[PDB]
Design a protein around this ligand. Structure first.
Ligand SMILES: COc1cccc(OC)c1CNC(C)=O
Length: 123
């Protein structure tokens, strides 16, 4: 049980996504971009990603580790910077704040998971 629990990341990521869903800054990133309505999005973005897809992928058990989840969430933010490159866009600003919040909170989820990993690999 809980010391170096290698499953704990799952619940912690579910909680973090819940917080993200609550932030007004996530509003543009909650659902896939409507690709039949916003035409050039796919001209610019190779692999769309959004927080509802991340939440569903976690709920389905299809993330092997919190590093996989982290990769998808990072893709949301890199996509925004590619599609909305301008520092004066308020949407650029939203993405930037929300990314900082995510990176702050995911930090301990990753180090705890890796700690656990190195513990059980050692013993
Ligand atoms: C097609 O992209 C659009 C279209 C309208 C508004 C808008 O910003 C709310 C965006 C940018 N959305 C993302 C997720 O990059």
């Amino acid at each position: 049980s809980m010391s170096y629990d290698i499953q704990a990341w799952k619940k912690q990521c579910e909680e973090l996504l819940n917080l993200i869903f609550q932030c007004e800054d996530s509003e543009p990133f909650r659902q896939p971009v409507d690709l039949l309505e916003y035409p050039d999005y796919r001209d610019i973005i190779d692999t769309p990603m959004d927080f509802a897809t991340v939440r569903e992928t976690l709920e389905a058990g299809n993330y092997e580790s919190p590093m996989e989840l982290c990769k998808d969430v990072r893709l949301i933010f890199s996509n925004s910077k590619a599609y909305t490159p301008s520092k004066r866009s308020r949407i650029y600003s939203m993405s930037l704040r929300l990314s900082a919040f995510f990176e702050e909170h995911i930090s301990s989820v990753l180090s705890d998971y890796k700690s656990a990993l190195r513990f059980h690999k050692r013993n």
